Symmetry: D3
């Protein structure tokens, strides 16, 4: 049941100083950070990440948005991490996101792109692809978090 | 899409020392406080604010409640602020409010009135009316919040 | 409308140092702690508490889980406390629990038992039974919380 | 008695950064009572009056520009030895020197031509009385019970 | 070894104000282990025994009234130099003097006939041993692993 | 100018305990800017280089074991007098002595053969320059605006 998912703390979150608060929500949930780094995504890498949206009217604005400032890419590991993180993120448009979710508590304002604080892989398949896009095997780790032993049988 | 809505931090919240926590939820969401003040509402003003409930059995208790102690009236500005703040507030009766919402996390106990921490305009029309009831143009401001520039195109 | 419900801060929560955070959610909601103590449940007491699950395949793992380390048993009092606390707890399996709920924000990983941070009585009847299992009348108290007077008529 | 009233100004840097709520919560959690509060946009005349004791100082200009840059939140806090207490809670004037745990220590650092320091707190009972008058009319100050007031009755 | 056990009492003012959880979280976050805990309503005899060293002091009466006003939460914290550490975390006896960041500094201020100060923390290992015995039976104290215990093995 | 860059290492004890976010938030809330950051697993050679000034000290071995026990998060913080400020925020080297409000004061206590103290913070501008180079390539450090940067323009 243990999976890995990719999360991008977007430019709006970085600029607003919400990196720590976002990471804490994942740590408190029990999710493990197995990879993480601040990078500045260029257009080529951004378009590969968002290839599925190439023919949508908001594509250019989305690329402008994700490459606006540095972001923090990180890999989260844990039981059904993909669906769980998607649930924690909330509705794509923050105004529709439920209070308690990341977008629900932190997002609202938008530009020509729907600024929504973070990105979260939509599936195990997508996570695998996205993780490979931003990380090399040497940047991903296997280690114990404090409470890991508790769940072992 | 930018709208203004009126919020009243009710007597139960003021007495319990929750003013700051409530305001923080709005600031963290990205909403801008364009007007705010602590006042003590008298019955005449209270009945005007709650005119729609004049013929309901709980009217008197509601007026007693909202005028029990000073309250904090404030105007919030932001993308679809009206519906967003209503969503953040949660169900009218706090016991039915979802965890994560203001009433869901802070409210429960009631008197002869359904004490529910805050008031939030139910529509743009109502917000306009309510704002005019408590504020003069000189008490409302237009200024930049830190991240405003980020969403400009 | 005032009821009492039994809550058990389970071994996973105790080991992870979440006792305070869980208690705070109840206090902030307006619920009153009328009884509380850290104990180490033995198998006999555990099986009585979870008698309803005796013939389910996960029974043994559940008993192992609840008796793994000391736990904190506490009685919460307040308007419709039973249903309210159940709502605050969230879905039985933490991965399905909504952000904002206790299990939604704190739970995820499991062992051979569905580790889910806390236990909450499912009904007034069950609460009465469970409370009697862990507490004597001398361990339950009637006293005023700061804001009690506010709701009196 | 020991009960005093002090004036706090949540300055433009705090308002802009969205820190109004966090600052207010610190005072509420301490047990201090908010007896008056409002968001206003201070004009040069009022700013100069509030900081009249510094009119003959080099940083005066930058200070006035700073305090009038955007709206602020002025408030009156009431409680046991409130003046000295809120001052202690505020921390050292220059936030870089303020201790972790204080408002300036946790929230302040960067400066402009003025030493941006999150909030203003009356320096003494005499200053508190003077400042409260500059920003509040008696009609805007209230006497009401906070939840735990009854607990401390002597 | 350096591992000690100290007694903490979350006093009536904290219980009434709904601060039990916030106080406990501070100790948990520090790495201290709760080896015993329960809500009790202290009677005059027990209160006087706990504060016997102050029986010959003016404020004794108000103190007993205060500590027995409502139920309290007594707990035993275990950890490296726990006694001095919890004392440091508590802050100055009179909360108005306690530094921001400490429990009394962030949560205490108002007083009654007694100097209400949120919690009690054993003053020394000798006092800790005596106080733990007054409130807890060995059967109510436990030895178990906290999540990160394994990380510090020497 | 007064703007400096310092190196912070969120040590294995903090990573294991799930405190990465809380630590980062303290720096963000202070107004400090994260110009570089990444999770890495320090090897003995790099650990020894970082702590070369302590290679001739008894606790050296335990220190290397500690800092390389699990992955860590290294980051560069930029801001007004960042070096001294982050040091102040960190608190006393031995967490038992660190004041409540500081990172070590609120989160640290227990130790192994090494004095586990949550994070590392450069001791001076000279050490900061040296340490930043050991962990980061110029290509991993960025220049960008944080939300309120415009507010402080002189
Ligand atoms: N402007 C705009 N952006 C969108 C829209 N839908 C998605 N996006 C952008 O593309 C991102 C990913 O979209 P998703 O449907 O989850 O795939 C969103 O988070 C947002 O950044 C849209 O309808 N309009
Ligand atoms: N006692 C009581 N009060 C109510 C009831 N419905 C609404 N109120 C009071 O009136 C307020 C506004 O009601 P709303 O339906 O949102 O218009 C509620 O927040 C509560 O204060 C009710 O059914 N009973
Ligand atoms: N392993 C396992 N444990 C369960 C399952 N259902 C319930 N439990 C355990 O039994 C507890 C109480 O279950 P509930 O249905 O609420 O009665 C759950 O919180 C969990 O600890 C299950 O399907 N599998
Ligand atoms: Cl949602
Ligand atoms: Cl963990
Ligand atoms: Cl709701
Ligand atoms: Cl902002
Ligand atoms: Cl749920
Ligand atoms: Cl209360
Ligand atoms: Cl200071
Ligand atoms: Cl109060
Ligand atoms: Cl102190
Ligand atoms: Cl732990
Ligand atoms: Cl220190
Ligand atoms: Cl910023």
């Amino acid at each position: 049941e243990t999976e890995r998912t990719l999360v991008i703390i977007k430019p709006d979150a970085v600029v607003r100083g919400l990196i720590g608060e976002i990471i804490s929500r994942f740590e408190k949930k029990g999710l493990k950070i197995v990879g993480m780094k601040m990078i500045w995504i260029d257009r080529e890498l951004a378009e590969k990440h968002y290839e599925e949206h190439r023919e949508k009217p908001f594509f250019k604005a989305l690329i402008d948005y994700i490459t606006k400032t540095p972001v923090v890419v990180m890999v989260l590991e844990g039981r059904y991490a993909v669906e769980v993180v998607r649930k924690m993120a909330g509705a794509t448009d923050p105004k529709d996101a439920a209070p308690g979710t990341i977008r629900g508590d932190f997002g609202l304002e938008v530009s020509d792109a729907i600024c929504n604080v973070i990105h979260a892989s939509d599936s195990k398949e997508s996570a695998e692809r996205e993780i490979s896009l931003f990380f090399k095997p040497e940047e991903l780790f296997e280690y114990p978090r404090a409470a890991d032993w508790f769940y072992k049988k």
